[PDB]
Amino acid sequence: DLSAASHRIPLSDGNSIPIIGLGTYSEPKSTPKGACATSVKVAIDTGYRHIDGAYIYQNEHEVGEAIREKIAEGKVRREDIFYCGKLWATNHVPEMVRPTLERTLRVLQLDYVDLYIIEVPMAFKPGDEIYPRDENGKWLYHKSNLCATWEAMEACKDAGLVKSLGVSNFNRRQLELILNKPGLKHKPVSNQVECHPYFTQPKLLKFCQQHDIVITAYSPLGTSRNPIWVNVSSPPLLKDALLNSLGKRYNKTAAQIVLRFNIQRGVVVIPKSFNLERIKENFQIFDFSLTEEEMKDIEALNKNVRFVELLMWRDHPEYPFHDEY
Numbered sequence: 001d002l003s004a005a006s007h008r009i010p011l012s013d014g015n016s017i018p019i020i021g022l023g024t025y026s027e028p029k030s031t032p033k034g035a036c037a038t039s040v041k042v043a044i045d046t047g048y049r050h051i052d053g054a055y056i057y058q059n060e061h062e063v064g065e066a067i068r069e070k071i072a073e074g075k076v077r078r079e080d081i082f083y084c085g086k087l088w089a090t091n092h093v094p095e096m097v098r099p100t101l102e103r104t105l106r107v108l109q110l111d112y113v114d115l116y117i118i119e120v121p122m123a124f125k126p127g128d129e130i131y132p133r134d135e136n137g138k139w140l141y142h143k144s145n146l147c148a149t150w151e152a153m154e155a156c157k158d159a160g161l162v163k164s165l166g167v168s169n170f171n172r173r174q175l176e177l178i179l180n181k182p183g184l185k186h187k188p189v190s191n192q193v194e195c196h197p198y199f200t201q202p203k204l205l206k207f208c209q210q211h212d213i214v215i216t217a218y219s220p221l222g223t224s225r226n227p228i229w230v231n232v233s234s235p236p237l238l239k240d241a242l243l244n245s246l247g248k249r250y251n252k253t254a255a256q257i258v259l260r261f262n263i264q265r266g267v268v269v270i271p272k273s274f275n276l277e278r279i280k281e282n283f284q285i286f287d288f289s290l291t292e293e294e295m296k297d298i299e300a301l302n303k304n305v306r307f308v309e310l311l312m313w314r315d316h317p318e319y320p321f322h323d324e325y
């Protein structure tokens with residue numbers, strides 16, 4: 001079923017997605033130029049065929065550079081690569097959707113993206129500033145309309161600029177608002193959310209499965225733990241005693257165990273790493289499997305505590321984390 005050479009799982013629209021991808025977020029201020037490009041190329045050489053990025057990460061051009069060079073090398077064909085892009089909060093005005101995607105297509109120098117998703121369910125005031133706030137530090141929000149934005153996304157697919165549509169950071173209510181929309185033409189094929197052994201997403205996963213929506217786990221290794229976004233109160237996932245003990249059973253690292261955990265349950269993982277050794281390590285999860293008991297042991301680690309709470313936007317009408325799921 002899942003092997004290094006063939007590991008694509010089905011999407012409800014007829015397309016498919018590699019069960020493991022390379023995450024590409026890296027702090028802009030302290031990340032050397034070229035580190036992303038180099039990493040993406042190392043990943044493709046390693047065997048990865050899926051790359052996750054976003055215009056707001058500020059390195060989307062580097063992802064494109066790497067993908068085009070490898071195609072030019074004859075390493076892969078455009079159809080062999082799966083790239084996911086994202087529409088940020090400051091770009092939810094319907095008429096802004098296509099222009100925003102076209103901007104990313106320019107940056108990448110590609111004809112289309114394989115997956116385009118609404119980054120967050122919250123709308124922010126339009127503009128160049130990714131994180132808008134007035135002189136008093138008050139966030140500049142905009143009025144959300146998930147159905148009008150979704151229709152704009154559907155138009156992008158019809159025009160051939162993207163293969164599949166999806167969302168990120170959506171809770172159950174926000175998903176059903178789209179699923180029950182009158183005249184729905186293209187239903188969400190995936191929902192990218194935080195998911196790992198400390199936050200297994202049991203109810204949201206079950207719901208998505210019932211609707212043929214595939215969950216992509218972001219921060220599958222528990223994040224880089226940057227105090228600005230991470231609830232450092234929760235201990236380091238990769239230091240967990242059990243996860244490390246289970247690794248010794250197969251001569252695998254904790255990271256490898258947590259990644260295998262999610263892919264074995266049908267959850268796509270997009271671990272980020274700009275380190276040669278680690279990029280390779282994270283991909284070695286097809287030469288072993290976890291027993292039924294081990295899957296249960298890992299599941300029991302769930303604390304129902306998120307590393308990514310986004311508390312700075314807790315008062316936004318569409319803040320996704322107030323509901324149980």
Ligand SMILES: NC(=O)c1ccc[n+]([C@@H]2O[C@H](COP(=O)([O-])OP(=O)(O)OC[C@H]3O[C@@H](n4cnc5c(N)ncnc54)[C@H](OP(=O)(O)O)[C@@H]3O)[C@@H](O)[C@H]2O)c1
Pocket residue numbers: 022023024025026052053119168169192217218219220221222223224225238253255256270271272273274275278279281282
């Ligand atoms: N849609 C959204 O709202 C959203 C939000 C957050 C993240 N994401 C996506 O999800 C991707 C993954 O999440 P993430 O970057 O937050 O965190 P992550 O994948 O959990 O990884 C965090 C840190 O783990 C380290 N690491 C990687 N492999 C390792 C290994 N084998 N052993 C020990 N440490 C290892 C990395 O350091 P090195 O690079 O030094 O190896 C990295 O800084 C992102 O890059 C992004 O593409 C999406």
Ligand SMILES: C[C@]12CCC(=O)C=C1CC[C@@H]1[C@@H]2CC[C@]2(C)C(=O)CC[C@@H]12
Pocket residue numbers: 025219223224225226227229230308
């Ligand atoms: C990757 C990241 C930084 C390093 C870290 O330690 C934890 C996170 C998770 C939340 C990410 C953030 C980067 C900026 C993002 C994309 C947003 O604008 C909303 C979600 C947020």
